Design a protein around this ligand. Sequence first.
Ligand code: DUP
Ligand code: CA
Ligand code: CA
Ligand code: CA
Ligand code: CA
Ligand code: CA
Ligand code: CA
Length: 901
Amino acid sequence: MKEFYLTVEQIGDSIFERYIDSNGRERTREVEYKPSLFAHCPESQATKYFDIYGKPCTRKLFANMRDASQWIKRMEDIGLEALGMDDFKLAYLSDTYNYEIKYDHTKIRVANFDIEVTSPDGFPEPSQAKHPIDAITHYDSIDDRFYVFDLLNSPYGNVEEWSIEIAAKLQEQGGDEVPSEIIDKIIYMPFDNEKELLMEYLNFWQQKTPVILTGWNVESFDIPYVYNRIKNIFGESTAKRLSPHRKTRVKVIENMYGSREIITLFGISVLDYIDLYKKFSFTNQPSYSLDYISEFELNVGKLKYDGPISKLRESNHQRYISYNIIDVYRVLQIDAKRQFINLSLDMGYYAKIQIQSVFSPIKTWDAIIFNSLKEQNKVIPQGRSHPVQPYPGAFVKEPIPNRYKYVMSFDLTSLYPSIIRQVNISPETIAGTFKVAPLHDYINAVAERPSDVYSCSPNGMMYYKDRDGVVPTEITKVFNQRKEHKGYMLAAQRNGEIIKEALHNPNLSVDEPLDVDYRFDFSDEIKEKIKKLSAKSLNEMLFRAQRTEVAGMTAQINRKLLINSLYGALGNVWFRYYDLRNATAITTFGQMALQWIERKVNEYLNEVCGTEGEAFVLYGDTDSIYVSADKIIDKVGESKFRDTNHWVDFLDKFARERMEPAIDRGFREMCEYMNNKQHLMFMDREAIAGPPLGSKGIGGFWTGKKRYALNVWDMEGTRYAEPKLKIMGLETQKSSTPKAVQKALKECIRRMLQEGEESLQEYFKEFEKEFRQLNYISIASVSSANNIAKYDVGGFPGPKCPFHIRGILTYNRAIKGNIDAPQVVEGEKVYVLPLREGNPFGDKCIAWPSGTEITDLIKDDVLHWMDYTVLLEKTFIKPLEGFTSAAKLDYEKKASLFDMF
DNA sequence: TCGAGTAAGCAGTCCGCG
DNA sequence: GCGGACTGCTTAC
Ligand SMILES: O=c1ccn([C@H]2C[C@H](O)[C@@H](COP(=O)(O)NP(=O)(O)OP(=O)(O)O)O2)c(=O)[nH]1
Ligand SMILES: [Ca+2]
Ligand SMILES: [Ca+2]
Ligand SMILES: [Ca+2]
Ligand SMILES: [Ca+2]
Ligand SMILES: [Ca+2]
Ligand SMILES: [Ca+2]
């Protein structure tokens, strides 16, 4: 086994490293690492070190890390560049692990924990830690055990021991339904007092010191609470035992309007699962409570209890502890599905960074590029201060709002990374500039050729063609990695569709799911056996295929995120390689590429249709074009098709065999025009959309930029068992839209696209008639709530107070004098409802914490005074009116001459 | 919302528009 | 009543 690091820290002149040694054992060492930095030197040297621009450098070896840091300072005092990796632990890792790191996750201690704190006087602030910690559940991945630390005696009540036998029992037996698969993995430890609980927890921690530390809100709540509580009871030295190097720092986390405190534990890598989820899930949720996210991800039921959480330990300690254990398990279940810890480990070891730095693509890419350059004895430039400046982005075509019956979309492969590679865009490949023509002139190929020597972008930048830049080289590596995982994702998706088809005809038999790899397209043999399976086995297979698809999605979309973020880092002032010339070279080239191929596709289709100046491309955004295929379908005639799948096959074949070759030809000419290094503009068919054959469905519609809906039959080679709605930007897709209204609007759209106007009209009439019966949470709007205090003038709305903030102020007055009532937290999300005139709350709306039932204090009154008429008009009718007017149809039947019959 | 980027939509406030 | 100027928020890419 090759060695690999677990954690690394700088503490003064020492590097403290935890690592796995060649024998698979965890070790710790302190190293008096002597860093090197670099200065430019005269050309007449015998040096082996050169900067990225090929200027010679001399290496300066320092007695210690403080000397190196002091030197950087003095070089600024003198006004000269201090080159090299200034984050010395990254240089340490580069020197100590000078090879592609192979890590073994079974040796990495991943701890998942959650604490309970009974509090009678509101939220227990971690900075005060004034209340006893009365439960800790700590799961250790190496032991595969849930360690439960239970406080039986507290100022807030003495309780009996938790019973594992009651915990395992069904809720219908009066039990807690702790999952059978973890029952034997629980190690239960009750305590007579909190001091003993905390002392044993620290002994346990010393024995099983986390490398990766996670859980839900652990960084913002559990870790600072535990640290500060131990600090209050025992003193600082004892609290610092949470760090394997006994070093901690209170860290101030700042944002635009306020700040908060977290505890940095040296030698631990904290990856709070809420933050992994927010960065890597590609969702925007109405609530980030663990209950809400667990229900969403796992389809598990909310953990039910009577009374407020502040009284749960005293009234039902049995359930209190069982729910603490279940909470820890739910995070493990979410990670089994989403695999964000696996992702973070992969990325972190790839880049050779502290694992917690995966949250920062700037840090990640700084390390990747440094390591790549170091291999060639090249020296990275010093980071510099830059003022924040706006720069231009992508092109989005203004669509004509309309219905669109048959639509084929086409999409460029990882566009911005492909532009970087094609043009060869990198800090050290800048060759110079040329005189720019208006963009229109390049799009129409009328402008003079930018260069006969260098590779160009239409922003005026020129790049060397003799060798790949470090940015192209390194982005290519991660791009290639993504390609593999996207393959697994799509195979799993196609395999899912095979199971969905078979589920129409399930055999009557007692059966087992097939032992297969869902990452690869099912063989003919597997397909034959599937057609003979029971519904029970097929559903299990479908669940497994969909889990495989999620696994692939995580791996691929987040490698996409990483490479897109290298582009974005080029336009962030804190990146070592920040350069607006390069960031703009990418975006301006993208604008040209899309509009150039719009022209080429229009020309090609006008030719094949023997027509003049017809606009076949109806829409485009960044890297995609949407093509009207009505005329292609009409040239065959609808009556000639056997079924929907027949015309879908026809369009699929037309796109692959006819359009893609012409698109390729168009892009190769563009490459020659810009004299690029390598042709990498690969635009493939994405979606095939249209109404079911013989129906009155409209197929699709656009209301404006970034707002459209399509009935899709085939997406990137996946032929759906049932057509799938692709809806972008519309209210069905927004977390701010009420849950029941997303559902209703989606059905309105389904009916529009698949069935037609009459079907839409019958559904609307029914929804309007019944909507007042819907649960208040399902019809509440959602919003983030920032700057509550800014708009709070003596408890009332100040000038220009936002609607949702107004609601929060209404809520705050209504719960005034209640320390127990849930508080709205600055920066979190709220549910919002409008209120009828003359209500007792004194205003037109009310808001309360999202993911929660409104407190019983005011629930009855909110329900009584909820303005259903305003709710319906604003969240449902207005957007529907938008969809229908765009699609040129009516959601209500207009009067006709037949009416008098 | 500590953590790569820009484009661009809609809700709502304020207030003009004879 | 609707638009523009503006803030706030959320989406597409
Ligand atoms: O989060 C994003 C998304 C997109 N983009 C830019 C870069 C990207 O290459 C371009 C196109 O984005 P898409 O999301 O359409 N996907 P891309 O072409 O990168 O990859 P894929 O092959 O999946 O579409 O828009 C970002 O900068 N950040
Ligand atoms: Ca809890
Ligand atoms: Ca793409
Ligand atoms: Ca594609
Ligand atoms: Ca069958
Ligand atoms: Ca795309
Ligand atoms: Ca192709």
